[PDB]
From a paper:
The three catecholic compounds are degraded by three evolutionarily related type II extradiol dioxygenases–DesB, LigAB, and DesZ–in S. sp. SYK-6. On the other hand, DesB exhibits not only a strict substrate specificity but also high enzyme activity for gallate. While LigAB is an α2β2-type tetramer, DesB is a β2-type homo-dimer. In this study, we analyzed the mechanism of the substrate recognition of DesB on the basis of the crystal structures of reaction intermediates.
His124, which is also conserved in type II dioxygenases, forms a hydrogen bond with OH of the substrate, which is an equatorial ligand of the Fe (II) ion. Earlier studies of extradiol dioxygenases suggested that His124 contributes to the deprotonation of the substrate by forming a hydrogen bond with OH. Since the His124Phe mutant shows no detectable enzyme activity (less than 0.01 U/mg), His124 is also indispensable to the enzyme activity for DesB. Furthermore, crystallographic analysis of this mutant showed that the His124Phe mutation is unlikely to affect the Fe (II) binding at the active site (see below). Crystal structure analysis of the anaerobic DesB (His124Phe)-gallate complex showed that the Fe (II) ion was located at the R-site. Gallate is bound to the active site of the mutant, and the carboxyl group of gallate forms hydrogen bonds with Asn387’ and Tyr391’. His124 and His192 function as catalytic acid and base for the ring-opening reaction, respectively.
Residue numbers in the entry:
A (entry chain A): 2 to 410
B (entry chain B): 2 to 412
């Protein structure tokens, strides 16, 4: 519930490559890693419990279904295979409870979201995190990733990215736990990596952008995609993600550190911001925002025999739901019927999860967090009509359930 | 550019079952199919060019990544395998041009979207569509699907679905083409298909909801998920999709038809709404809306050597982007290096597309509609540094291009 501050850093994959190759005293790379140092120190000293991490996926985990604001709600994240195998880094833990609270708040404020679990984080995340945080066996903090669809136009306007951050601030502050949260905005600065214009940079615009983001961020909010692409290059226009992070910080921040280097394609820049707290009370109190974020499902627990599929339940039921979802694949479902045990022994299912499936325990799976539409698939594959499932839910014989209907179908 | 009207219809998979199992003379189902006939007849007579189709996917094509408003921008859609194999139905054609226009207007109005291509439509689409439209060889109209994330809470508020509809109305009207567009809201009405409460229905609420939706829809906009699940069953609360559709129509509509049947788990309902056009001119003219939708990329064409990855480009490059995306799979990329010609023959790639990859024609791929991030994967798989790709883009040798860099470095 306390925002300690925020940081901005480029996420170009070269940072990771330079790290993995130990170019720490290379004449080109030495002052660059030195640029990351104050951010690295601040993080080790401040010890945030969670980093809210704003990034974009580079057509790896997001392609055929490509969303604007994709909130990671899952228990943990591994490095994505980008075509060269997964980087050797430990998984980083997520925060389902914080992510759900944020989703509730952001939807109440009429932002439209996507929710995701299980997919890998590409270089947009693990390039800068691997240089910012020590990771021998695990990571020093949890993450809540926000993957932003900045690559397929139209994308949200600059002012929308900013307004998301403003609502995000209130969301994090109203979270009823005494934790410390840092916000990260990544990508940028100037660059262009496609077409005959590949290699464009604008150091002059970069410095201006940094200054304005720090000290007058509102003056950036009228910039169009054309403006940002003209000034910073096509891919450099991803800096709207910095705006989102900056919007989540206090209107006035202190700049603890800032650096800038351009050795090759991308302006590798870093900024560190110390949150100053609120200069005045927010328009709506923490207690009031909490009540408002809960109003949609207020009193839902008074509906008996009902198990609303909320984010917490989706996380709880994720392994078993993911498993049953695979029944839409011809080979998997053939195996489910002929050799279920061989399929179980290969899975990551708990013994209890296997047991629920083997027993065809319909109501138990619902209690546990399986969504009905996965059971529907399971029933179909096993030759079991939906009527059987409903009868089990109700504790009735098939005919006695059928009696509650107007016609037996 | 002309909204002729809209229909509301249940999407329960049981409609497809009865249809496929040929049940038009069965005593239970015959009257039900007769309930669909006024909507079927109106579609056949009115001949919309496109139906804007509002539905939800039932954890089939949308699961690990689950979005609120998922707009289908692609060229065609096939039935999804839902665990029983693909229903035997032909592909239905999309409308990428109208989809792109709609996206531009909606983002300008600050709705946050998802774009998708190539994935199957589950029963949410093909159940009612198969009874409403003839399809033995092909479909009579195009579709623009909008898959709504109604299953994983928090979901957008009722008023948000309605405001989406209001903005969608203007988006379709301002589309500079002389076409007829029908709007479909699907799902509902009362039902609950999970838990000890499974089997719940509420016919009185169903009728009142429909009457209010037809004649006073703004009286519904303060309904919470709890209100809607209490009155209509947990899954019955998806009727916010009906609201979105209703939001897209004239403030006054003529309700040509209403039917209602409850044989089993789901209140099977139909409504046909004739659009009454606009009583007064819109708050913002069509001309002004077109310009505002275009103002984010206004003047981007002045930027040389640049190829904005817009929806039209994402559609054009879809097959080749999708192919090169698969390089993230260990088995596919080993095959790419070891037997590319074999991989090509099994693919759906046109010869133009295969040739581009075969020649490692980097700039030609960018011109074609391949996004750089797919070429980055291809380069890496073949052991080529990004530096060679960039030099190829600039029409320079590696050494020549390196000179433009402050430091000539390796990666
Ligand atoms: O090859 C590079 O320097 C490079 C590759 C990327 O994918 C990227 O996003 C970037 O900013 C730079
Ligand atoms: O077995 C059923 O009647 C059934 C199954 C579904 O997946 C569904 O959405 C529905 O409204 C009814
Ligand atoms: Fe990026
Ligand atoms: Fe549905």
């Amino acid at each position: 519930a306390k925002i300690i501050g925020g940081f901005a850093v480029s996420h170009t994959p070269t940072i990771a490559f330079a790290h993995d190759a130990n170019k720490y005293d290379d004449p080109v790379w030495a002052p660059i890693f030195q640029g990351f140092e104050p951010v690295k120190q601040w993080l080790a000293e401040q010890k945030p419990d969670v980093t809210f991490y704003v990034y974009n996926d580079h057509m790896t985990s997001f392609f055929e279904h490509y969303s604007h604001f994709a909130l990671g709600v899952g228990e943990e994240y591994s490095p994505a295979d980008e075509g060269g195998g997964q980087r050797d880094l430990p998984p980083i833990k997520g925060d389902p409870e914080l992510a759900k609270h944020i989703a509730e708040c952001l939807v109440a404020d009429e932002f439209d979201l996507a929710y995701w679990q299980g997919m890998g984080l590409d270089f947009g995340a693990f390039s800068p995190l691997s240089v910012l945080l020590p990771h021998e066996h695990g990571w020093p903090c949890r993450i809540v990733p926000l993957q932003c669809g900045v690559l397929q136009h139209p994308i949200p306007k600059a002012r929308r990215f900013w307004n998301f951050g403003r609502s995000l601030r209130r969301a994090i502050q109203s979270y009823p736990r005494d934790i410390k949260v840092a916000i990260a905005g990544t990508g940028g600065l100037s660059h262009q990596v496609h077409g005959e214009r590949a290699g464009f940079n604008n150091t002059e615009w970069d410095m201006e952008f940094m200054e304005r983001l720090a000290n007058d961020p509102e003056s950036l909010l009228g910039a169009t995609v054309t403006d940002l692409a003209k000034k910073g290059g096509w891919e450099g226009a991803e800096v709207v993600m910095w705006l989102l992070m900056r919007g989540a910080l206090s209107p006035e921040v202190k700049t603890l550190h800032q650096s800038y280097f351009l050795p090759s394609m991308t302006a590798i820049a870093t900024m560190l911001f110390e949150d100053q707290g609120d200069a005045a009370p927010p328009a709506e109190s923490d207690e009031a925002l909490r009540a408002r974020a809960k109003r949609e499902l207020a009193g839902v627990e008074e509906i008996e025999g009902t198990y609303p599929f909320t984010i917490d339940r989706a996380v709880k039921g994720f392994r078993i739901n993911h498993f049953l979802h695979r029944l839409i694949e011809p080979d998997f479902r053939k195996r489910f019927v002929e050799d279920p045990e061989g399929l179980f022994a290969e899975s990551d299912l708990t013994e209890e999860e296997k047991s629920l499936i083997r027993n065809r325990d319909w109501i138990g799976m619902i209690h546990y967090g399986v969504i009905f539409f996965m059971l529907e698939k399971m029933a179909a594959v096993l030759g079991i009509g939906n009527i059987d499932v409903y009868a089990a839910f109700r504790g009735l014989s098939v005919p006695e359930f059928q009696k509650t209907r107007n016609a037996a179908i």
